[PDB]
Design an enzyme around this catalytic site. Structure first.
Site, PDB file in Angstrom:
ATOM      1  N   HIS A 124       0.833  -1.200   0.000  1.00  0.00           N
ATOM      2  CA  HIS A 124       0.000   0.000   0.000  1.00  0.00           C
ATOM      3  C   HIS A 124       0.866   1.249   0.000  1.00  0.00           C
ATOM      4  CE1 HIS A 124      -2.170   3.300   2.041  1.00  0.00           C
ATOM      5  NE2 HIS A 124      -3.294   2.762   1.602  1.00  0.00           N
ATOM      6  N   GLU A 125       1.819   1.300   0.917  1.00  0.00           N
ATOM      7  CA  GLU A 125       2.625   2.499   1.038  1.00  0.00           C
ATOM      8  C   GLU A 125       3.499   2.697  -0.190  1.00  0.00           C
ATOM      9  OE1 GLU A 125       1.841   4.451   3.174  1.00  0.00           O
ATOM     10  OE2 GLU A 125       0.891   3.288   4.791  1.00  0.00           O
TER      11      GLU A 125
ATOM     12  N   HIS B 231       1.684   4.362  -3.124  1.00  0.00           N
ATOM     13  CA  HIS B 231       1.624   5.825  -3.142  1.00  0.00           C
ATOM     14  C   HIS B 231       2.734   6.415  -4.013  1.00  0.00           C
ATOM     15  CE1 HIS B 231      -1.687   6.498  -0.489  1.00  0.00           C
ATOM     16  NE2 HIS B 231      -1.137   5.854   0.525  1.00  0.00           N
TER      17      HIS B 231
ATOM     18  N   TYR C 135      -3.905  14.489  -2.780  1.00  0.00           N
ATOM     19  CA  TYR C 135      -4.276  13.718  -1.590  1.00  0.00           C
ATOM     20  C   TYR C 135      -5.394  14.436  -0.828  1.00  0.00           C
ATOM     21  CZ  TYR C 135      -3.445  10.126   1.994  1.00  0.00           C
ATOM     22  OH  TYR C 135      -3.568   9.051   2.854  1.00  0.00           O
TER      23      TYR C 135
ATOM     24  N   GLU D 195      -6.011   6.785  -2.239  1.00  0.00           N
ATOM     25  CA  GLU D 195      -6.061   5.801  -1.157  1.00  0.00           C
ATOM     26  C   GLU D 195      -6.559   4.449  -1.659  1.00  0.00           C
ATOM     27  OE1 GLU D 195      -3.891   6.680   1.546  1.00  0.00           O
ATOM     28  OE2 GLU D 195      -5.208   4.973   1.917  1.00  0.00           O
TER      29      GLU D 195
ATOM     30  N   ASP E 137      -9.691  13.863   8.037  1.00  0.00           N
ATOM     31  CA  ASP E 137      -9.013  12.890   7.175  1.00  0.00           C
ATOM     32  C   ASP E 137      -8.894  13.415   5.733  1.00  0.00           C
ATOM     33  OD1 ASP E 137      -7.876  10.279   6.436  1.00  0.00           O
ATOM     34  OD2 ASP E 137      -9.850   9.887   5.531  1.00  0.00           O
TER      35      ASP E 137
ATOM     36  N   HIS F 164      -9.403   8.341   3.517  1.00  0.00           N
ATOM     37  CA  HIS F 164      -9.347   6.985   4.045  1.00  0.00           C
ATOM     38  C   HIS F 164     -10.735   6.410   4.289  1.00  0.00           C
ATOM     39  CE1 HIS F 164      -5.101   8.061   5.369  1.00  0.00           C
ATOM     40  NE2 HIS F 164      -4.915   6.838   4.905  1.00  0.00           N
TER      41      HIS F 164
HETATM   42 CL   LIG Z   1       0.177   9.032   3.499  1.00  0.00          CL
HETATM   43 CL   LIG Z   2      -1.631   6.236   4.036  1.00  0.00          CL
HETATM   44 NA    NA Z   3      -7.411  14.834  11.303  1.00  0.00          NA
HETATM   45 ZN   LIG Z   4      -2.489   5.426   2.010  1.00  0.00          ZN
END
Ligand SMILES: [Cl-]
Ligand SMILES: [Cl-]
Ligand code: NA
Ligand SMILES: [Zn+2]
Ligand SMILES: [Ca+2]
Ligand SMILES: [Ca+2]
Ligand SMILES: [Ca+2]
Ligand SMILES: [Ca+2]
Ligand SMILES: [Cl-]
Ligand code: NA
Ligand code: NA
Ligand code: NA
Ligand code: NA
Length: 316
Positions: free
Chosen positions: A142-143, A146, A157, A166, A226, A231
């Site tokens: 996942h990371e 990005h 983002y 995401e 967020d 997310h």
């Molecule tokens: Cl991030």
């Molecule tokens: Cl993240």
């Molecule tokens: Na926050």
């Molecule tokens: Zn992420």
């Protein structure tokens, strides 16, 4: 550092034993020379200055408690690189075999991992909410994804762009986890989340609403937290990708799956050819229909399931 390429052995966050590529020069360093311009794992030493110091070891054996997060970050970085090379013909995250750098033991009791624009970084968790976050392959992939997104579509983002950013990272983290096997599922982070509470995960793709995340556009978060819900609203896109791969009926709309590999081919083509920094869900729908038509034809089954899954999650 420069030296001879070697192979060490170590134990991961969950106590499994694995082989890792190292480099020997007085010490053995966590420097894998076999993959592109290299994979480099660093020790952040419980501080927040990055990267820290390249991981050095005396005997090329990594069985200490302190070592396990480094073992897994180094190893799963390699597996993710092999996924992108062998499945989509991408050489590292920029397409040009860039060096992959990761720090571990970042801060104290730090319950997250992230991409900072230049490298990966992994906390140790607090031992009850999280155990060290590189222990989960879907987290690492996942990371790393990005970085792939930053170098291609460039998705901002924030708001819908960021939920897409995401959701792409969840999609490929899962696809990597399936690629490596080892108990693949449609959950995010089940291996490192809440030790001592089985069955749960950070996010669910099969059913995002299990953890309160929207599974339909009508239920989208529209506020401040967020970064505009990047997310949270990713659950809408995560459900669509689930429907596309495995099929199902969702809010009365039935979708037939076309399998994992074809989900991958189609979304990779969307990210690298059609998405823009400011794409929103509707452009994601159009972008994904084009890849399907590109790869499978105007009246394919594949273009059909794509349309259905987005109808199912309410994306027009
Ligand atoms: Cl991030
Ligand atoms: Cl993240
Ligand atoms: Na926050
Ligand atoms: Zn992420
Ligand atoms: Ca050692
Ligand atoms: Ca799993
Ligand atoms: Ca998973
Ligand atoms: Ca758990
Ligand atoms: Cl120590
Ligand atoms: Na191995
Ligand atoms: Na290998
Ligand atoms: Na299933
Ligand atoms: Na056509």
């Amino acid at each position: 550092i420069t030296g001879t390429s070697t192979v060490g052995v170590g134990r991961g966050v969950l106590g499994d034993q694995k082989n890792i590529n190292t480099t020997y020069s007085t010490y053995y360093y966590l420097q894998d020379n076999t993959r592109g311009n290299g994979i480099f794992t660093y020790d952040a030493k419980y501080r927040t200055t990055l990267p820290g110091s390249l991981w050095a070891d005396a005997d090329n054996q990594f069985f200490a408690s302190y070592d396990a997060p480094a073992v897994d970050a180094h190893y799963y970085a390699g597996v993710t690189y092999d996924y992108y090379k062998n499945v989509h013909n991408r050489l590292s995250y920029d397409g040009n075999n860039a060096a992959i750098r990761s720090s571990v033991h970042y801060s104290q009791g730090y319950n997250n991992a992230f991409w900072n624009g230049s490298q990966m970084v992994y906390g140790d968790g607090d031992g009850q909410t999280f155990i060290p976050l590189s222990g989960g392959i879907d987290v690492v992939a996942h990371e790393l994804t990005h970085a792939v997104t930053d170098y291609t579509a460039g998705l901002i983002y924030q708001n819908e762009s960021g939920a897409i950013n995401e959701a792409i990272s969840d999609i490929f983290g899962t696809l990597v986890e399936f690629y490596a096997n080892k108990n693949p599922d449609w959950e995010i982070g089940e291996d490192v989340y809440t030790p001592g509470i089985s069955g749960d995960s950070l996010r669910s793709m099969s059913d995002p609403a299990k953890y309160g995340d929207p599974d339909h556009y009508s239920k989208r978060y529209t506020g401040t937290q967020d970064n505009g819900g990047v997310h949270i609203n990713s659950g809408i896109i995560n459900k669509a990708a689930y429907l596309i791969s495995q099929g199902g009926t969702h809010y009365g709309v039935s979708v037939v799956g076309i399998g994992r590999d074809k989900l991958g081919k189609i979304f990779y083509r969307a990210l690298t050819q059609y998405l823009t920094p400011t794409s929103n869900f509707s452009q994601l729908r159009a972008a994904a229909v084009q890849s399907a038509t590109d790869l499978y034809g105007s009246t394919s089954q594949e273009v059909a399931s794509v349309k259905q899954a987005f109808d199912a999650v309410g994306v027009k």
